[PDB]
Amino acid sequence: MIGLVGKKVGMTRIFTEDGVSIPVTVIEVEANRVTQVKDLANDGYRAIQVTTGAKKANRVTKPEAGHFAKAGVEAGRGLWEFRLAEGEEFTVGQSISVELFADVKKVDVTGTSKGKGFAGTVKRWNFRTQDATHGNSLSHRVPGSIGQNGKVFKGKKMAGQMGNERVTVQSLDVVRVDAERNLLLVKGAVPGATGSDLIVKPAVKA
Amino acid sequence: MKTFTAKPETVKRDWYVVDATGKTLGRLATELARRLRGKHKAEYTPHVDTGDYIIVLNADKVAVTGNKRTDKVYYHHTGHIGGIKQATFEEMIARRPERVIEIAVKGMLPKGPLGRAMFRKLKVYAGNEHNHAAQQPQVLDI
Amino acid sequence: XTXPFXX
RNA sequence: GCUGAAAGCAUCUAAGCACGAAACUUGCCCCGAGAUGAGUUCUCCCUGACCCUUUAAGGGUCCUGAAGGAACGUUGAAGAC
RNA sequence: GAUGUCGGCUCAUCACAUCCUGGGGCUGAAGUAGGUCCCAAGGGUAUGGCUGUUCGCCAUUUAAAGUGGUACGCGAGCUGG
RNA sequence: GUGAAGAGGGAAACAACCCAGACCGCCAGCUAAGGUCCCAAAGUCAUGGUUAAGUGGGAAACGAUGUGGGAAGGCCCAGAC
RNA sequence: CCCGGCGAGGGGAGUGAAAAAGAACCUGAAACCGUGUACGUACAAGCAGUGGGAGCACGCUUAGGCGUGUGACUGCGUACC
Ligand SMILES: C=CC[C@@H]1/C=C/C(=O)NC/C=C/C(C)=C/[C@@H](O)C[C@@H](F)Cc2nc(co2)C(=O)N2CCC[C@@H]2C(=O)O[C@@H]1C(C)C
C-alpha cells in the first residue's frame, strides 16, 4: 500500500534480551496529513498527496497557502505522492500516524544520497589503481584507455558528480513502532544525512 | 511569365477523416503521403505545404498479407553500444499501434523541415473516437 | 635518431 | 504434444488448440514533457485615462508595479564556478 | 614533406563456432557420472613459480578458469623488460 | 573500347561498366539506357500464367509425398491401393 | 578657457586653402577589430554555394506589380594546386 514521509534522526544500537545488538535507523515520522485525493475522472491515476512538518507563516507562498487552505490543513515542508493499489481510500484533512506500519514487518526506504561532489573513477566506479612506482609518470590514479584505434561509447564510466541523487534501499526489517514518540526503528542504514527527508513504503520484494 | 508557385500564407488546407480497418498498410499510407504533400492539388508546390489535414481512426485494425504480422521486424537504436531493440508487428499494435502508420509515412515523405511539417498534419487514433469534430472534418473513402 | 622520439 | 485431414490408414499442422529456457517484452531501481508530438491537476496575482498614427496581433505617453522571482547578506552533512 | 612496433598495466567493447550456469533430443543413458547434437550470448569466466615474453610447463584452486574481432583493441593513457 | 585528356543521364552513392560526344542562350517538344505506388518526374495500366519463400533482395554438392505443367507406363466394378 | 593627477589624453577657441594637418602629421587600399540600421536566425545535420522561391524593409513608382538588400522552405551539389 502507501508509505509515509519522515526524517532521518540518526542511528543507534538496540540490545535485546538475548544480548544481541540490532543496528537501527531511527526516523521521526511526524503525523502526516493528506492534501489532495485524485481520481481518474480528472487526472488519470489513483493516488494521493501528503505533506508533513511545518513552515513559517511569512515565508510560505500564497499559491500553496490556498492549496493547503483548500483542504483546511496547516502547511508543511513539502509535498509527495503515493499511488493506490486499487483498494485504498482517503479523504483530505485526514491525519495518518506511524501505526500504519504495525503489521508489515518490512519496508523499502528511499532518500537522497550524501554529496561527494566531483569524484574520480576510483571513488566512483571502484577502478583499479595503476602502479605507484616502477616507471609510472603522472598516471597513478588515472583511468587509462577509454576506447580503441574512434568515439567514446555512451555510458563510459568516467569521473563526475557522485551522490546527491535518489536512492532506494529495499527489504529493511522493522524493529519497533512507538506511536507515542512518532518513531520508526528500521534495521540497517538508509540514505541521506541526519535531518534529511526520506520516504518509507512497505516492501514489494517481500 | 514565371510559372505559378503556391504561397503558404494564403493557401487552403482542408480536414478529412479516415478508417484504416481492413486496409493494407503500404497501399494505404502511400495515399496519405500523396495528400499531406499536396500532389493531389492543382496548386502543388514541392517547397510548400499545400496538403490536407487527415484524421485516421482504428489504427489497431490494419490489414497485412503473409506472416508480416509476426515476421515483420521494427528495428531501432537508442544511441548506445547494445542499443538495437527489435519489435515484431504484433508487439507494436498491442503496445502502441499509432506508431505503425506514423512510421510508414515517415519513410514515404521527404526528409527535411517540410516532410516533418507534413507529419504534423497527420493525426492517428487507435479507436473510433476523437475531439476534432470542431474542425468540421470530412469523409474520405481511401 | 636514437630510437623512439627523441632518445 | 492433443485433435486431425490433405493421402479412407498414419502424422505435432495445413485451419484450430495446449506445454515450453538465465535470451527478448514485463515486473525491481534511477534519469525522464527540449516527449518543439514541447503533456496533465490544484492554487495564487493584474478588472487603468487617452492621444496619434501605412488603422494594425500597430506605436507612444501619464498613472499603475501585484502574485512571484532575482539580487544582496548570514550559511549548509550542497558545492570546482 | 613520418600511420610509433611484441608483452605487461589500465580501461574496456562486440560476435557466438558455448567454458560454467539455464532449456532439450538420441545415448552401447540402470543410478551417480559422462559422450554426442540442438536452442541459448542474460550475467559470470583463477591466483602464483620460471621466462622480456604471448604461448607453454609446473603447483594449488574454481560451478567454469571460453574461442575470436576491435591498427595481432588501447604509448597526444602508463610502462620500456 | 572507354578513362587518362570526356562533362551529361543510369547503375542507391561508385575515373575504366550501359546510354550518349557539352559552341552560347530560352520556364519548347520528341527519344536512348533505365524506369513508371511513395521519398522521386512517369501505368496501383491491359491479357493470360507462376511463386507463399518477403523467395524476390548473397551461394554449392546433396536431401525432400513443396508446387504447377508435359509425355508415357504398371496395376484398377474379375473389386484394385 | 574647461574635464583630468600643476598628468597622459581629449573638447572649444585660434592660425591656415586644409586640424577629416595635433608633429603617432601628404595621399591613407586590404587583411584584421568594432559601433549603428534593415532582414534573417535557438526541431535543425554535411565545401556553406547554385537554380527556383515565400515573406519583410527601403527607394522608385504619376498605385504600374520593376530594381536594390535580406534569403524561411526546396532540387542538385564531397574545395584549390
Ligand atoms: C636504429 C633504429 C631502428 C630503425 C629505425 C628507423 C627509423 O628511421 N625510425 C623512425 C620511425 C618512423 C616512423 C614510426 C614512421 C611512421 O610514420 C610509419 C611507421 F609506423 C611504419 C612502420 N615502421 C615500422 C614498421 O612500419 C618499423 O619497423 N619501425 C617503426 C619504429 C622503428 C622501426 C624501424 O624502422 O626500425 C629500424 C630497424 C628495423 C633497423
XYZ file of C-alpha atoms (C1' of nucleotides) and ligand atoms in Angstrom:
719
model
C 0.000 0.000 0.000
C 1.091 3.615 0.589
C 4.117 4.860 2.510
C 4.944 7.909 4.614
C 7.426 10.765 4.948
C 9.803 11.213 7.863
C 13.206 12.499 8.973
C 16.497 10.669 9.458
C 17.312 11.307 13.114
C 20.411 9.090 13.131
C 21.416 5.581 14.124
C 21.668 3.800 17.462
C 22.076 0.319 18.932
C 19.227 -1.854 20.219
C 20.079 -4.540 22.780
C 17.649 -7.453 23.007
C 17.193 -9.832 25.941
C 19.489 -12.493 24.452
C 22.311 -9.945 24.234
C 22.177 -9.133 20.514
C 22.803 -5.663 19.084
C 20.446 -4.769 16.223
C 21.545 -1.693 14.233
C 18.631 0.669 13.661
C 17.987 3.895 11.758
C 15.557 5.910 13.867
C 13.085 8.018 11.882
C 10.897 10.851 13.190
C 7.728 10.220 11.176
C 5.629 13.201 12.203
C 1.865 12.905 11.844
C 1.193 13.122 8.116
C -1.815 14.876 6.594
C -3.459 14.418 3.204
C -3.691 17.416 0.877
C -5.294 16.062 -2.303
C -7.247 12.970 -3.341
C -7.091 12.459 -7.107
C -9.053 10.069 -9.309
C -9.303 9.089 -12.979
C -12.186 11.384 -13.956
C -9.812 14.377 -13.825
C -6.168 13.264 -13.551
C -5.999 9.622 -14.660
C -4.423 7.644 -11.825
C -5.456 6.727 -8.289
C -3.027 8.426 -5.905
C -2.887 10.891 -3.009
C -0.924 13.973 -1.965
C 0.624 14.030 1.508
C 2.684 16.646 3.327
C 4.188 16.906 6.816
C 6.195 19.152 9.081
C 5.532 22.862 9.393
C 6.664 26.123 7.823
C 6.888 29.801 8.672
C 3.828 31.944 8.007
C 5.638 34.878 6.373
C 7.827 32.572 4.253
C 5.423 30.188 2.504
C 3.981 31.343 -0.804
C 0.373 32.372 -1.392
C -0.229 29.814 -4.181
C 0.496 26.951 -1.786
C -1.391 28.676 1.040
C -4.630 28.240 -0.881
C -3.514 24.762 -1.917
C -3.213 23.820 1.757
C -6.049 26.057 2.961
C -8.316 24.366 0.411
C -8.058 21.166 2.471
C -8.064 23.064 5.775
C -4.676 21.545 6.651
C -1.777 23.520 8.093
C 1.186 23.968 5.778
C 4.067 21.513 5.661
C 7.662 21.430 4.414
C 6.956 19.761 1.073
C 4.676 17.571 -0.997
C 4.782 13.943 -2.115
C 2.531 11.465 -3.901
C 1.637 7.809 -3.394
C -0.184 5.553 -5.840
C -3.118 3.487 -4.584
C -3.345 -0.274 -5.129
C -6.960 -0.386 -6.323
C -8.148 -0.854 -2.737
C -7.155 2.285 -0.831
C -9.382 5.248 0.022
C -8.621 8.504 1.821
C -10.034 11.981 2.369
C -8.495 15.438 2.560
C -7.584 16.607 6.048
C -7.125 13.000 7.168
C -4.185 12.623 9.552
C -2.036 9.498 9.215
C 0.109 8.132 12.041
C 3.057 5.758 12.249
C 0.824 2.856 13.329
C 0.170 2.205 9.629
C 3.353 0.081 9.668
C 2.170 -2.018 12.620
C 1.763 -5.318 10.731
C 4.077 -5.044 7.715
C 7.426 -6.360 9.060
C 9.361 -4.902 6.092
C 9.696 -1.652 4.150
C 11.697 -0.116 1.301
C 13.150 3.252 2.296
C 14.022 5.965 -0.209
C 16.026 9.158 0.059
C 18.778 11.298 -1.386
C 22.374 10.179 -1.002
C 25.189 12.194 0.525
C 27.109 14.660 -1.605
C 30.628 13.613 -2.560
C 30.903 16.289 -5.236
C 33.189 15.820 -8.208
C 34.539 12.296 -7.738
C 37.101 10.196 -9.560
C 36.795 6.842 -11.264
C 38.232 5.048 -8.226
C 35.949 6.701 -5.673
C 33.046 6.293 -8.108
C 33.496 3.120 -10.185
C 35.912 1.126 -7.983
C 38.587 1.310 -10.669
C 41.916 -0.439 -10.168
C 44.760 1.958 -9.433
C 47.873 1.829 -11.596
C 51.411 1.246 -10.359
C 52.516 3.921 -7.903
C 56.195 3.350 -8.751
C 58.342 1.392 -11.198
C 58.032 3.877 -14.063
C 54.623 5.492 -13.619
C 54.568 9.045 -14.981
C 51.705 11.240 -13.743
C 49.310 8.312 -14.277
C 48.811 6.846 -10.814
C 45.056 7.261 -10.237
C 44.047 7.906 -13.858
C 41.576 5.735 -15.813
C 43.812 4.625 -18.660
C 42.387 3.765 -22.063
C 38.861 4.880 -22.919
C 38.491 3.385 -26.379
C 40.179 1.820 -29.395
C 42.059 2.697 -32.587
C 37.062 6.436 -32.913
C 34.460 7.558 -30.391
C 33.939 7.040 -26.678
C 30.869 4.849 -26.310
C 27.959 6.322 -24.393
C 27.762 5.358 -20.746
C 31.549 5.148 -20.492
C 32.448 5.076 -16.812
C 34.153 8.392 -16.072
C 34.646 10.941 -13.317
C 31.819 13.224 -12.294
C 29.308 14.085 -9.616
C 28.928 11.250 -7.104
C 25.901 11.338 -4.824
C 23.048 13.745 -4.191
C 20.632 11.558 -6.137
C 17.538 9.481 -5.475
C 18.414 6.208 -3.737
C 16.103 3.395 -2.624
C 17.106 0.632 -0.213
C 14.820 -2.399 -0.136
C 13.576 -5.002 2.334
C 14.622 -3.439 5.629
C 13.389 -5.255 8.716
C 11.326 -3.237 11.172
C 12.217 -3.473 14.857
C 9.819 -1.264 16.825
C 6.978 1.211 16.316
C 6.389 3.770 19.091
C 3.438 5.951 18.116
C 3.755 7.889 21.382
C 7.048 9.255 20.026
C 6.069 9.043 16.332
C 9.202 6.994 15.645
C 10.119 4.020 13.477
C 13.087 1.726 14.132
C 14.319 0.423 10.769
C 17.137 -2.111 10.750
C 20.329 -1.207 8.938
C 21.407 2.001 7.253
C 19.491 4.291 4.908
C 20.468 7.081 2.514
C 20.689 10.735 3.396
C 22.229 12.555 6.332
C 20.671 13.477 9.656
C 17.727 15.812 9.126
C 17.043 14.869 5.508
C 13.551 13.838 4.456
C 13.042 10.251 3.324
C 10.203 8.009 2.177
C 9.208 4.744 3.847
C 6.953 2.340 1.953
C 6.010 -1.310 2.539
C 8.243 -3.862 0.843
C 7.159 -5.238 -2.522
C 10.002 -7.796 -2.617
C 8.570 -9.499 0.499
C 5.612 34.683 -67.223
C 7.048 32.876 -64.222
C 5.331 29.572 -63.517
C 2.771 29.537 -60.722
C 4.052 28.795 -57.224
C 1.874 28.421 -54.144
C 2.237 30.631 -51.080
C 1.662 29.115 -47.611
C 0.247 32.396 -46.282
C -2.980 32.223 -48.328
C -3.263 28.557 -49.351
C -6.236 26.458 -48.287
C -5.957 23.288 -46.213
C -8.945 21.012 -45.635
C -9.688 18.410 -42.970
C -10.609 14.785 -43.617
C -11.252 11.607 -41.640
C -10.378 8.007 -42.492
C -10.844 4.478 -41.152
C -7.966 2.108 -41.911
C -9.669 -1.030 -40.574
C -9.213 -3.750 -43.180
C -6.870 -1.599 -45.275
C -3.409 -2.710 -46.337
C -0.512 -0.844 -44.761
C 1.521 0.311 -47.749
C -1.292 0.625 -50.281
C -2.992 2.900 -47.720
C -0.207 5.092 -46.328
C 1.004 5.566 -49.904
C -2.127 7.640 -50.497
C -1.640 9.532 -47.229
C 1.783 10.952 -48.084
C 0.465 11.769 -51.559
C -2.120 14.027 -49.881
C -0.207 15.583 -46.982
C 2.382 16.542 -49.617
C -0.155 18.163 -51.943
C 0.414 16.052 -55.061
C -3.383 15.738 -55.397
C -3.889 19.515 -55.677
C -3.554 21.651 -58.790
C -1.509 24.176 -56.776
C 1.157 21.570 -55.983
C 4.499 23.053 -54.968
C 7.464 20.992 -53.702
C 8.712 23.725 -51.339
C 5.268 24.459 -49.845
C 2.751 22.588 -47.692
C -0.380 22.506 -49.858
C -1.751 19.385 -48.156
C -4.930 18.495 -46.294
C -5.136 17.519 -42.637
C -6.144 13.903 -42.044
C -7.563 12.000 -39.071
C -7.321 8.218 -39.417
C -9.257 6.112 -36.913
C -8.980 2.469 -35.864
C -5.227 2.165 -36.333
C -5.234 -1.140 -34.416
C -7.141 -2.899 -37.225
C -4.874 -2.516 -40.257
C -4.546 -5.370 -42.743
C -1.354 -7.154 -43.794
C -0.518 -10.113 -46.023
C 1.740 -13.059 -45.356
C 3.313 -13.596 -41.953
C 4.336 -9.935 -41.707
C 2.092 -9.744 -38.639
C 4.772 -11.899 -36.968
C 7.868 -11.746 -39.191
C 7.959 -8.003 -39.897
C 10.553 -6.568 -37.513
C 10.830 -2.937 -36.407
C 14.462 -2.265 -35.545
C 15.695 0.937 -33.933
C 18.626 2.252 -31.921
C 18.984 4.310 -28.752
C 22.496 5.719 -29.152
C 24.393 3.142 -27.115
C 26.521 0.046 -27.695
C 23.813 -2.567 -27.324
C 21.204 -0.108 -28.456
C 19.468 -2.227 -31.063
C 15.966 -3.266 -29.995
C 13.582 -5.267 -32.168
C 9.795 -5.477 -32.098
C 7.506 -7.522 -34.315
C 4.363 -6.137 -35.924
C 2.212 -7.694 -33.196
C 4.311 -6.351 -30.315
C 3.726 -2.823 -31.652
C -0.043 -2.958 -32.204
C -0.639 -4.270 -28.688
C 1.689 -1.687 -27.120
C 1.486 1.304 -29.470
C -0.477 0.851 -32.717
C -0.324 4.514 -33.753
C 3.427 4.350 -34.386
C 2.897 1.843 -37.208
C 1.254 4.388 -39.505
C 3.400 7.194 -38.096
C 6.465 5.221 -39.206
C 5.246 4.097 -42.630
C 4.549 7.731 -43.508
C 7.976 8.794 -42.243
C 9.574 6.666 -44.959
C 7.299 7.885 -47.742
C 7.770 11.602 -47.044
C 10.711 13.875 -47.859
C 13.494 14.239 -45.305
C 13.572 17.829 -44.108
C 11.750 20.629 -42.298
C 8.928 20.211 -44.818
C 8.433 16.455 -44.585
C 8.311 16.809 -40.809
C 5.712 19.576 -41.091
C 3.504 17.328 -43.221
C 3.589 14.741 -40.431
C 2.215 17.367 -38.045
C -0.899 17.481 -40.236
C -1.295 13.735 -39.593
C -3.441 12.628 -36.652
C -3.946 8.981 -35.698
C -6.180 7.362 -33.097
C -6.283 3.686 -32.176
C -10.052 3.787 -31.632
C -13.002 5.394 -33.395
C -13.372 8.488 -31.183
C -11.734 11.905 -31.367
C -12.180 15.517 -30.273
C -11.546 17.114 -33.675
C -15.145 17.390 -34.908
C -14.982 21.093 -34.023
C -12.819 21.442 -37.150
C -15.710 20.260 -39.355
C -13.900 17.214 -40.782
C -14.957 15.287 -43.867
C -15.001 11.671 -45.021
C -12.530 10.002 -47.375
C -13.029 6.502 -48.799
C -9.332 5.760 -49.214
C 67.685 9.125 -34.372
C 68.426 7.477 -31.014
C 65.362 5.120 -31.021
C 61.823 6.416 -30.185
C 61.203 10.270 -30.304
C 63.832 11.511 -29.441
C 66.033 9.140 -27.300
C 2.080 -32.677 -27.680
C -3.857 -33.411 -28.138
C -7.363 -33.279 -32.364
C -6.880 -34.015 -37.418
C -7.423 -34.169 -42.858
C -4.750 -33.477 -47.448
C -3.242 -39.022 -48.710
C -10.170 -43.898 -46.244
C -4.671 -45.839 -42.561
C -0.619 -42.800 -40.327
C 1.073 -37.991 -38.997
C 2.563 -32.046 -33.606
C -0.317 -28.661 -38.707
C -2.126 -27.237 -43.295
C -7.358 -24.486 -40.225
C -7.819 -24.926 -34.760
C -5.566 -25.968 -29.669
C -2.225 -26.920 -25.185
C 3.157 -27.066 -22.796
C 7.947 -24.891 -23.322
C 14.819 -21.598 -21.104
C 19.121 -17.216 -17.019
C 17.557 -14.704 -24.117
C 13.506 -10.868 -25.894
C 8.672 -7.830 -23.654
C 7.247 -7.140 -18.350
C 7.517 -6.617 -13.271
C 12.548 -4.225 -9.198
C 15.831 0.644 -9.163
C 17.454 5.707 -11.313
C 17.139 9.831 -15.100
C 12.796 11.433 -17.521
C 7.381 16.867 -21.084
C 13.507 20.474 -25.485
C 8.271 13.745 -25.452
C 9.339 21.534 -30.461
C 4.116 15.425 -30.813
C 7.141 20.654 -26.100
C 1.549 16.953 -21.805
C -1.928 16.825 -17.209
C -4.125 18.638 -11.934
C -4.703 22.193 -7.902
C -3.857 27.094 -6.027
C -2.397 32.433 -6.276
C -1.885 37.666 -8.828
C -3.240 42.065 -12.627
C -10.673 44.077 -13.853
C -6.450 51.895 -15.865
C -7.004 57.627 -18.838
C -6.102 58.986 -23.679
C -3.614 60.606 -27.943
C -1.770 59.843 -32.630
C -0.889 57.023 -36.480
C 0.905 52.795 -43.627
C -5.667 51.637 -38.648
C -2.654 47.054 -37.290
C -1.847 40.577 -33.252
C 0.360 48.604 -34.683
C 3.186 52.625 -31.970
C 3.937 56.128 -27.866
C 2.839 58.953 -23.321
C 0.735 59.649 -17.937
C -0.862 56.734 -13.901
C -0.340 51.826 -12.020
C 4.088 47.798 -10.470
C 0.600 42.945 -7.637
C 1.378 37.148 -7.366
C 6.235 35.836 -7.615
C 11.290 35.999 -8.886
C 16.147 37.785 -8.694
C 19.960 40.398 -6.455
C 22.344 41.197 -1.656
C 23.510 39.065 3.073
C 24.267 35.071 7.121
C 25.242 29.895 5.536
C 24.860 24.352 4.512
C 26.209 16.679 6.398
C 25.293 21.333 -1.191
C 29.262 22.590 -3.954
C 35.329 23.433 -8.864
C 32.462 28.037 -10.789
C 57.383 16.526 -46.953
C 56.623 10.185 -40.537
C 50.051 5.627 -39.884
C 55.388 4.646 -33.486
C 56.245 -1.894 -33.361
C 55.836 -7.555 -29.033
C 54.348 -8.271 -23.968
C 52.718 -6.357 -19.352
C 49.352 -2.490 -16.665
C 44.743 0.089 -17.095
C 40.022 0.740 -19.304
C 37.044 -1.929 -21.994
C 33.591 -3.391 -26.221
C 31.092 -6.540 -29.871
C 30.397 -11.538 -32.464
C 28.756 -16.981 -30.999
C 31.547 -21.591 -33.963
C 29.090 -22.100 -25.533
C 33.985 -22.700 -20.815
C 30.290 -22.745 -16.499
C 25.165 -21.819 -15.125
C 19.784 -22.487 -17.949
C 16.372 -25.473 -21.532
C 16.170 -30.235 -24.603
C 16.797 -34.863 -28.358
C 19.455 -39.852 -29.066
C 22.665 -42.421 -25.925
C 26.344 -49.054 -26.343
C 21.685 -43.094 -20.917
C 20.349 -48.533 -14.743
C 21.795 -44.824 -10.917
C 25.782 -41.390 -9.891
C 28.900 -39.506 -13.512
C 29.906 -38.874 -18.816
C 29.598 -38.773 -24.533
C 27.253 -36.664 -28.817
C 23.953 -32.910 -31.096
C 20.318 -28.838 -30.912
C 18.261 -23.765 -28.696
C 20.551 -20.072 -25.897
C 25.475 -14.501 -25.575
C 21.472 -12.666 -19.555
C 25.424 -12.421 -16.341
C 29.843 -14.604 -14.934
C 34.588 -16.521 -16.587
C 41.869 -18.040 -11.014
C 45.823 -16.850 -8.325
C 51.216 -17.775 -8.359
C 56.541 -20.120 -9.657
C 60.357 -19.917 -14.335
C 60.869 -16.978 -18.522
C 61.048 -9.916 -21.593
C 57.638 -12.990 -23.302
C 52.128 -14.010 -25.765
C 52.153 -19.134 -25.622
C 53.720 -23.176 -22.812
C 55.140 -26.467 -18.497
C 54.569 -26.831 -13.193
C 51.818 -26.058 -8.056
C 47.257 -25.181 -5.901
C 42.131 -23.608 -6.776
C 37.334 -22.719 -9.057
C 30.404 -24.147 -10.935
C 33.712 -22.805 -15.070
C 39.223 -20.665 -15.313
C 35.546 -19.958 -23.197
C 37.073 -19.227 -28.679
C 37.781 -14.778 -31.575
C 37.172 -9.227 -33.744
C 38.284 -4.324 -32.397
C 45.649 -0.902 -36.422
C 47.683 -9.419 -33.835
C 41.807 -3.106 -29.277
C 44.188 0.556 -26.170
C 52.206 4.666 -25.793
C 48.563 13.077 -27.578
C 46.639 6.763 -21.180
C 51.353 4.415 -18.177
C 55.470 1.130 -18.821
C 60.094 0.335 -21.811
C 61.930 -5.871 -19.790
C 36.610 0.105 -76.421
C 36.223 3.910 -72.510
C 39.276 6.551 -68.858
C 43.756 9.088 -68.988
C 42.584 14.158 -71.913
C 35.189 13.319 -71.655
C 31.380 16.590 -68.769
C 25.893 14.897 -69.078
C 21.790 10.730 -67.789
C 21.532 5.482 -65.471
C 23.673 1.617 -62.248
C 21.305 3.960 -54.298
C 26.333 6.622 -53.831
C 30.783 4.177 -57.337
C 37.621 7.741 -63.186
C 37.551 2.444 -66.575
C 30.681 -0.708 -66.922
C 25.412 0.697 -70.011
C 23.267 5.122 -72.998
C 25.315 9.306 -75.152
C 30.168 13.109 -77.547
C 28.642 19.552 -73.579
C 29.914 26.481 -79.175
C 26.283 30.068 -76.178
C 21.023 31.245 -74.609
C 15.262 30.010 -73.825
C 10.200 28.243 -67.851
C 9.660 24.459 -76.181
C 8.911 19.344 -77.681
C 10.187 14.081 -79.163
C 13.673 9.943 -77.604
C 18.226 6.197 -75.587
C 19.994 3.416 -71.467
C 16.975 2.781 -67.397
C 12.291 3.132 -65.384
C 6.687 4.422 -64.403
C 2.765 3.164 -55.667
C 5.669 6.886 -52.055
C 10.624 9.533 -50.795
C 11.130 10.673 -56.720
C 9.429 13.050 -62.871
C 6.149 8.932 -65.412
C 0.694 2.782 -65.728
C -1.667 0.857 -58.168
C -2.297 0.147 -66.733
C -4.290 -4.489 -70.171
C -4.317 -10.130 -71.088
C -3.063 -14.959 -69.668
C 0.242 -17.870 -66.084
C 3.752 -18.936 -61.921
C 5.671 -18.335 -56.744
C 3.827 -18.258 -50.497
C 9.612 -18.489 -49.561
C 9.392 -11.155 -48.390
C 11.756 -16.158 -52.456
C 12.360 -11.833 -54.987
C 16.578 -8.910 -52.151
C 24.011 -13.250 -51.401
C 25.715 -19.162 -52.541
C 27.315 -25.425 -53.981
C 27.498 -30.781 -53.593
C 23.330 -33.189 -51.506
C 18.484 -34.182 -49.432
C 12.991 -33.666 -49.735
C 4.833 -37.177 -50.850
C 6.767 -28.402 -51.785
C 4.156 -26.929 -56.137
C 2.393 -26.242 -61.462
C 2.958 -28.228 -66.013
C 4.334 -32.363 -70.038
C 4.678 -37.364 -72.365
C 4.035 -42.409 -71.153
C 3.980 -46.933 -68.342
C 2.203 -50.836 -64.354
C -1.915 -52.382 -61.765
C -7.972 -50.976 -61.459
C -16.519 -52.568 -60.797
C -12.703 -60.170 -62.463
C -13.311 -55.083 -56.671
C -7.580 -52.691 -57.253
C -4.160 -49.047 -53.340
C 39.181 78.519 -21.265
C 37.327 73.599 -19.375
C 37.481 67.770 -17.562
C 41.869 65.401 -15.810
C 46.752 63.635 -11.043
C 50.034 71.946 -11.549
C 49.231 64.211 -15.692
C 48.907 61.469 -20.297
C 44.865 62.004 -23.478
C 40.844 64.986 -25.103
C 36.926 69.154 -26.081
C 36.266 74.542 -27.702
C 38.820 78.937 -29.462
C 42.542 80.389 -32.877
C 46.321 80.126 -37.387
C 45.828 78.313 -42.269
C 43.406 76.915 -48.881
C 43.470 72.049 -45.434
C 43.043 70.467 -37.652
C 38.982 64.945 -41.521
C 47.424 68.556 -40.685
C 47.867 67.531 -33.056
C 54.431 66.789 -35.449
C 52.000 58.877 -33.626
C 51.249 64.640 -39.263
C 50.560 64.310 -47.952
C 47.732 60.624 -50.351
C 45.758 56.684 -46.462
C 43.945 50.443 -50.007
C 43.417 45.168 -47.935
C 43.761 41.554 -44.223
C 42.261 42.213 -39.057
C 38.874 44.634 -34.769
C 34.478 47.385 -33.798
C 29.512 50.845 -33.313
C 24.810 51.711 -35.716
C 20.427 50.287 -39.049
C 17.344 46.791 -42.265
C 16.306 41.488 -42.857
C 17.139 36.532 -41.279
C 18.287 33.113 -37.079
C 17.531 28.905 -30.926
C 13.422 20.898 -34.296
C 17.527 21.943 -37.097
C 22.519 17.972 -39.858
C 27.424 17.999 -44.048
C 32.852 22.630 -49.394
C 28.080 26.766 -46.809
C 27.043 27.837 -52.898
C 23.832 27.423 -57.157
C 18.581 27.246 -59.678
C 13.814 28.271 -58.140
C 11.474 30.945 -54.420
C 7.559 32.885 -49.785
C 7.645 36.859 -46.622
C 9.934 41.552 -44.586
C 12.264 46.635 -45.158
C 13.565 50.808 -48.264
C 13.656 53.581 -52.842
C 11.191 54.084 -57.456
C 6.747 54.244 -58.887
C 2.056 59.865 -61.711
C -0.561 52.768 -57.050
C 2.459 50.149 -62.906
C 3.162 44.638 -59.501
C 10.377 46.607 -61.562
C 15.069 47.281 -59.085
C 18.235 47.080 -54.511
C 19.328 44.127 -49.653
C 17.916 40.304 -46.596
C 17.015 34.587 -48.176
C 12.335 30.936 -44.195
C 11.403 26.343 -47.282
C 13.122 23.304 -51.749
C 16.108 20.178 -56.007
C 21.264 19.302 -57.372
C 25.984 19.719 -55.089
C 32.375 15.863 -51.258
C 37.408 22.992 -52.011
C 42.098 24.553 -54.962
C 47.119 23.206 -56.502
C 68.210 2.428 -35.124
C 66.876 2.498 -35.246
C 65.992 1.361 -35.717
C 65.383 1.580 -37.122
C 64.571 2.870 -37.187
C 64.447 3.642 -38.287
C 63.729 4.888 -38.351
O 64.039 5.753 -39.163
N 62.719 5.039 -37.485
C 61.899 6.238 -37.356
C 60.424 5.920 -37.232
C 59.486 6.259 -38.139
C 58.050 6.029 -38.002
C 57.494 5.394 -36.735
C 57.256 6.360 -39.047
C 55.749 6.186 -39.178
O 55.250 7.338 -39.807
C 55.349 4.978 -40.038
C 55.677 3.641 -39.364
F 54.903 3.452 -38.300
C 55.596 2.424 -40.306
C 56.472 1.287 -39.832
N 57.619 1.395 -39.217
C 57.979 0.167 -38.892
C 57.077 -0.717 -39.477
O 56.092 0.008 -40.063
C 59.191 -0.183 -38.188
O 59.753 -1.251 -38.445
N 59.683 0.703 -37.272
C 58.984 1.856 -36.700
C 59.626 2.071 -35.344
C 61.071 1.728 -35.625
C 61.026 0.580 -36.663
C 62.206 0.667 -37.608
O 62.131 1.123 -38.751
O 63.339 0.253 -37.008
C 64.596 0.352 -37.674
C 65.294 -1.035 -37.584
C 64.433 -2.150 -38.212
C 66.694 -1.053 -38.227
